[PDB]
Design a protein around this ligand. Structure first.
Ligand SMILES: CNc1ncnc2c1ncn2[C@@H]1O[C@H](CO)[C@@H](O)[C@H]1O
Lengths: 211, 336, 271, 232, 53
């Protein structure tokens, strides 16, 4: 039993439902990428290189990416990292040039963190034009006594990469994709595209139980 | 030392006097009072249409209209009586963490990680809903916001502060400081003359809206506070925390009155709300359920485990007819 | 006879198991809203197919065996009921396979091509083709088309007395049992090849289990019929065995499809 | 808010025309547009209705099977195509907006109308009078009666109250019962119970002269009253 | 020197308060939640007829 007005109200509700569903679909074809890391870690460099909260929407190879930079939040209280679940990946930028210990503790924090248990992380050492000149000052023992390798770029860089990878104590579920190629080359986005493609394919398979 | 010594001796002696003059806890005076029984509540309506996590929700003053914000960048105004979507406002920023419904019913406020409190006008002559104003000036994320009137709103922020604004001018009339951590929730007093806010510094405090002075501060807590609400008489307030405990304080005794915790509860409280009588404290946890606590006995008077995700937001109508609960599972549920 | 008692006993036990398993799958899917997406749509379609293959086809097979005098058409109806239900289960298996293939090979474009509307449209097309294949015999191909006694109206119901062997072999088996098995085989093999190249023996184990059980249970009776249609003889015991194997795939599907998704396992263990 | 009608004129019997309502200044796309008519000094008569989304189209018994109502949301334009026009289709036609949700006013704004000249069950509501002398400052009480009880199970008594001033289109005074519209002076009030309904005006002013109309929305077709005139 | 002076002034402001014993506060909440109990639907639910939901 509906009055002359309740039937029009139901019609309005149904029209709103249709609009909500058709916009949620549009919102589900979008790859959400969190951007994290310390200051002067290239975060500003990457956002320009990339094709309050600052959202950069860019399209690459038909994939629409919303990259959220949250470096603006000057409160380091992670009371909003839970808001970034479901993000396809976390792009973590660090600079070789004891700041490194700071970056290590941040990487351990973001990786170990439970909101991001399965979220594969895209570690970056974008720049490569100042990462070699300052290794001739001294080996990786300015604040890292444990290293015993050749004080050259490839040896030390590989050692650092491996030590940051070691902070992954949950590979069973997530993966780390590391990048070193110079930031000047515009391959920072292409590597992000490949990694998100891999993460999505594996998410699909891990969903039907095939994985 | 004199300033450090003065601060230490002050705090110590005030707290010692407060403890000494403390008579009894909340439970000690209500032991003879009978309990409420089991609050068995059924999901009368289920609001479908949100396609992401629901972060904030606020009842309208008519006890029939609702406003809820989702992570999908959508603010839906619902007719709870028929689950008939009245309005769908596309928010400018999809990262929205708070909602408010104007007491007059003409405006709705929202905002989040964008550090802005947007105010939308509902009763326009054009038949749509438009952005009336945007309040800016906070540096940290937007934790909570509540209308004082049609032209005066109060806000809390990760800026470790709060702000009283004048919506017409768009400038922050007063700035309240004193917190050392992110302020996560504020509640407006029934008379709209004070407010209480809890921060990530594991402390709450009562701030006067008129003088902009820090009236009182409350402590005795381990972790941050994510939710705060007044008793319906504005003579007390309850806080919820990641500690996995809820605490009821009084603004006159200046001391914590009661603790709301259970051993099996291991995770924090996302939202807190009171019954129209202030007899049932409803708390949303990360355990995908919502617990009803006897506000005087501290016992669990029931549960609302109809959601398969954490109960992000709670709300009770002004007439106390129903309870809205919103979770990360993208559904609001009305319980009665 | 002992064989009849055993056949009835095994059939009833297998059907009861299938019904319990599929009902548990449906209870688990509905309880958790998290399990309500495309893959679970195909899985629940298979679950309904199996509940039908266990609730009607089991009593119907027992009744066809007892051979009571029950009219030509009531018997033909029971046979066409058993066809529409079994073919529906096989079609649900084929659907799960095609979905997996699309996920791997469409890559990201998959969610943009697979929407709820097309999913309900494909599940519906599957059930419609199952009903068409099963009820076809009542419209021309039946033993009455060859009987010179158009006056045989009441007769003891025997499966070989109503359903022509040439339909169950050329149409039922070679088109709706063998073709699904061959296409599922090719799909899973290509999926494993691609996933290996990109990344893994866990996947290979699961895909093989699936293909093995389905072939292990649907090829037995099919070959029995094929032999009976080329005027070959088969012991009655063997006929009982083929029928039991088919109706056992009906109950086995829940354990080798829904229990391999971690989400489903967690939910089932919680319950 | 602006609703401007067009397409009127003189038409011989047996012809067809299309009244257009070129709306402006509001969200016509999400608005349920009605078509009303007023015959020369005889009163308002509902013509048709189309809801938001074109999901519900209603016609009056007079125009049922003859005349049609079409929406164009992207162009914000209502339409009324009239096929066969008898001598009784001579009247000034109004385009009206109407939005339906809890608490809304479904006849807030009327258009200015357009004239059409032609050569030569349903609830009935009666207005007790048609002319009442009065002077400024003296309170007035209009009234009208209805056949059924407009009070529905919702608790809403779907009786409306419009005022048509000399030489201008009707204006909505009330939309359920005493619920004053937006922009109307607070002096106007409404009341009633079931069948007998009254509109009270305290401190009457010079702009309050005209014809008062009571319509019902409980069931279709919508039926207006004769029109109670106020003299001065 | 004023940086901590303002902090100690805030502490002093927090000190000079008309402190009302906790047991007094508990009684007030008890009375308020007892006087508004008969009209609390969620605590004493309305019959289905009037229940808007
Ligand atoms: C000689 N052939 C047969 N004898 C008995 N049941 C048979 C059969 N061929 C098929 N069936 C039944 O028909 C269905 C389709 O193969 C199965 O569920 C079996 O129960």
């Amino acid at each position: 039993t509906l009055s002359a007005e309740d039937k029009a109200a139901v019609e309005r509700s149904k029209m709103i439902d249709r609009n909500l569903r058709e916009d949620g679909e549009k919102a589900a074809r979008e790859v959400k990428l969190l951007l994290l890391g310390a200051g002067e870690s290239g975060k500003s460099t990457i956002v320009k290189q990339m094709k309050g909260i600052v959202e950069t929407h860019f399209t690459f190879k038909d994939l629409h990416f919303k990259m959220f930079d949250v470096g603006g939040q000057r409160s380091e209280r992670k009371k909003w990292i839970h808001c970034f679940e479901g993000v396809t990946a976390i792009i973590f930028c660090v600079a070789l040039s004891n700041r490194m210990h700071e970056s290590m503790k941040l990487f351990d924090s973001i990786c170990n963190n439970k909101w991001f248990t399965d979220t594969s992380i895209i570690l970056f050492l974008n720049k490569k034009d100042l990462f070699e000149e300052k290794i001739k000052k001294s080996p990786l023992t300015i604040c890292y006594p444990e290293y015993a390798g050749s004080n050259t770029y490839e040896e030390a860089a590989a050692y650092i990469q491996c030590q940051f990878e070691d902070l992954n104590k949950r590979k069973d579920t997530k993966e780390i994709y590391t990048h070193f190629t110079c930031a000047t080359d515009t391959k920072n986005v292409q590597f992000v595209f490949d990694a998100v493609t891999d993460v999505i394919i594996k998410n699909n398979l891990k969903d039907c139980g095939l994985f | 030392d004199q300033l450090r010594q003065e601060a230490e001796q002050l705090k110590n002696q005030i707290r010692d006097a407060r403890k000494a003059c403390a008579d009894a806890t909340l439970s000690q005076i209500t032991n003879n009072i009978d309990p409420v029984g089991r609050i068995q509540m059924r999901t009368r309506r289920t609001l479908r249409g949100h396609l992401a996590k629901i972060y904030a929700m606020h009842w309208g003053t008519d006890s029939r209209l609702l406003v809820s914000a989702s992570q999908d960048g959508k603010l839906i105004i619902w007719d709870s009586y028929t689950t008939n979507k009245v309005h769908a406002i596309p928010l400018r920023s999809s990262w929205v963490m708070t909602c408010a419904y104007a007491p007059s019913g003409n405006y709705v406020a929202c905002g989040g990680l964008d550090n802005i409190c947007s105010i939308y006008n509902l009763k326009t002559r054009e038949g749509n809903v438009r952005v009336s104003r945007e309040l800016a000036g906070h540096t940290g994320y937007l934790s909570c916001c509540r209308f004082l009137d049609d032209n005066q709103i109060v806000t809390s922020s990760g800026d470790t502060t709060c702000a009283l604004w004048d919506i017409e001018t768009g400038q922050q009339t007063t700035t309240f400081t004193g917190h050392t951590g992110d302020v996560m929730s504020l509640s407006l007093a029934p008379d709209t003359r004070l407010f209480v806010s809890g921060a990530c510094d594991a402390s709450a405090k009562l701030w006067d809206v008129r003088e902009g002075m820090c009236r009182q501060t409350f402590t005795g807590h381990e972790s941050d506070i994510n939710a705060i609400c007044f008793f319906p008489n504005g003579n007390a307030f309850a806080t919820g925390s990641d500690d996995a405990t809820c605490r009821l304080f009084d603004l006159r005794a200046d001391q914590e009155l009661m603790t709301y915790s259970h051993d099996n509860i291991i995770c924090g409280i996302t939202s807190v709300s009171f019954s129209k009588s202030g007899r049932l404290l409803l708390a949303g946890y990360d355990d995908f359920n919502c617990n009803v606590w006897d506000a005087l006995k501290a016992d669990r008077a029931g549960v609302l485990a109809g959601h398969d995700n954490r109960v992000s937001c709670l709300g009770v109508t002004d007439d106390g007819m129903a309870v809205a609960t919103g979770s990360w599972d993208s559904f609001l549920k009305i319980w009665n | 006879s002992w064989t009849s008692v055993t056949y009835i006993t095994v059939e009833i036990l297998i059907g009861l198991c299938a019904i319990v398993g599929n009902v548990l799958v449906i209870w688990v899917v509905k309880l958790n809203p998290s399990l309500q997406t495309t893959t679970f749509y195909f899985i629940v379609s298979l679950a309904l197919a199996d509940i039908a293959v266990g609730v009607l086809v089991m009593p119907l097979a027992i009744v066809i065996s007892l051979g009571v005098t029950i009219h030509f058409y009531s018997c033909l109806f029971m046979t066409c009921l058993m066809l529409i239900f079994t073919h529906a289960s096989i079609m649900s298996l084929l659907a799960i396979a095609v979905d997996r293939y699309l996920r791997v090979k469409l890559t990201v474009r998959y969610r943009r091509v697979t929407t709820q509307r097309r999913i309900w449209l494909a599940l519906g097309l599957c059930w419609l083709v199952s009903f068409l294949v099963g009820l076809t015999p009542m419209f021309g191909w039946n033993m009455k088309l060859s009987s010179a006694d158009e006056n045989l109206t009441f007769l003891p119901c025997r499966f070989r007395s109503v359903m022509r062997m040439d339909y169950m072999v050329y149409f039922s088996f070679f088109l709706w049992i063998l073709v699904p098995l061959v296409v599922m085989c090719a799909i899973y093999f290509d999926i494993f090849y691609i996933i290996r190249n990109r990344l893994e023996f866990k996947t290979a184990k699961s895909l093989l289990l699936v293909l093995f059980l389905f072939a292990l249970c649907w090829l037995p009776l099919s070959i029995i019929n094929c032999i009976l249609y080329f005027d070959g003889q088969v012991p009655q015991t063997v006929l009982y065995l083929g029928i039991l194997l088919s109706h056992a795939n009906s109950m086995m599907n829940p354990i080798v499809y829904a229990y391999k998704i971690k989400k489903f396992k967690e939910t089932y263990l919680l319950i | 808010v602006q609703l401007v009608e067009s397409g009127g004129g003189l038409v011989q019997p047996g012809g067809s025309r299309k009244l257009s309502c070129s709306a402006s200044g509001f969200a016509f796309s999400s608005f349920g547009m009605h078509w009303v008519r007023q015959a020369p000094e005889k009163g308002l008569e509902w013509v048709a209705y189309i809801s938001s989304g074109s999901g519900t189209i209603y016609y009056a018994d007079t125009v049922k099977g003859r005349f049609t109502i079409s929406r164009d949301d992207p162009k914000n334009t209502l339409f009324l195509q009239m096929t066969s026009l008898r001598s009784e289709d001579t009247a000034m036609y109004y385009c009206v907006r109407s939005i339906y949700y809890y608490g809304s006013s479904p006849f807030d704004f009327w258009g200015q109308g357009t004239t059409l000249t032609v050569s030569s069950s349903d609830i009935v509501m009666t207005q007790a009078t048609s002319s009442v002398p009065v002077t400024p400052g003296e309170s007035v009480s209009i009234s009208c009666r209805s056949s059924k009880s407009l009070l529905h199970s919702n608790g809403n008594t779907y009786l409306y109250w419009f005022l048509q001033r000399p030489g201008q289109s009707p204006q909505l005074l009330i939309y359920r019962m005493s619920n004053l519209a937006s922009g109307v002076p607070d002096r106007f009030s409404g009341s009633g119970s079931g069948t007998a309904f009254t509109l009270t005006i305290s401190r009457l002013e010079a702009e309050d002269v005209g014809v008062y109309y009571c319509m019902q929305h409980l069931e279709y077709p919508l039926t207006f009253g004769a029109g109670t005139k106020l003299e001065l």
